[PDB]
């Protein structure tokens, strides 16, 4: 339709923003513990999928918790300590989150450049309708 380009770019921007927000939240909760109701904090990731309308935009179905084992730290003085006196610290890969943020920023800038070019082309298109 020559106008689904805007939809594709907007979906890409929204997905990149979601992924960046997830990475930022993980970085903020890198060294947290004992969230609500006492359950240990676990990191989360996002999964990108394409919308087969062929070629289509990107979407994020749901946020998936990481299955990597939590860090078990010996500290009996914490009420969260089990019979072995261990507390469950969250699994956060700082380098992984930095790389994810870098990738999200680069994809966002590429998509905004594509939007700029297509907007210029579409503005120039209407000059022939007179």
């Amino acid at each position: 339709a020559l106008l689904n380009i805007f939809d594709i770019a907007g979906s890409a921007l929204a997905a990149q923003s979601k992924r960046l927000n997830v990475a930022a939240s993980n970085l903020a909760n890198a060294d947290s513990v004992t969230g609500p109701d006492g359950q240990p904090y676990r990191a989360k990731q996002v999964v990108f999928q394409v919308d087969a309308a062929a070629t289509g935009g990107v979407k994020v179905a749901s946020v998936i918790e990481s299955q990597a084992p939590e860090k078990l730290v010996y500290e009996p003085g914490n009420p969260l300590a089990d019979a072995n006196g261990y507390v469950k610290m969250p699994n956060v890969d700082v380098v992984g989150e930095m790389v994810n943020t870098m990738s999200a920023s680069r994809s966002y800038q590429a998509n905004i450049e594509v939007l700029n070019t297509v907007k210029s082309m579409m503005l120039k298109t209407l000059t022939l309708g007179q």
Binding site: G10, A14, P36, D37, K59
Partner: peptide, 21 residues
């Protein structure tokens, strides 16, 4: 349903409980 679509009713208000009630 899908984010960014059109809905006839507002979403419930957001809250961030520090501790569970």
């Amino acid at each position: 349903g899908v984010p960014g679509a059109l809905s006839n009713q507002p979403a419930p208000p957001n809250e961030a409980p520090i501790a569970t009630p």
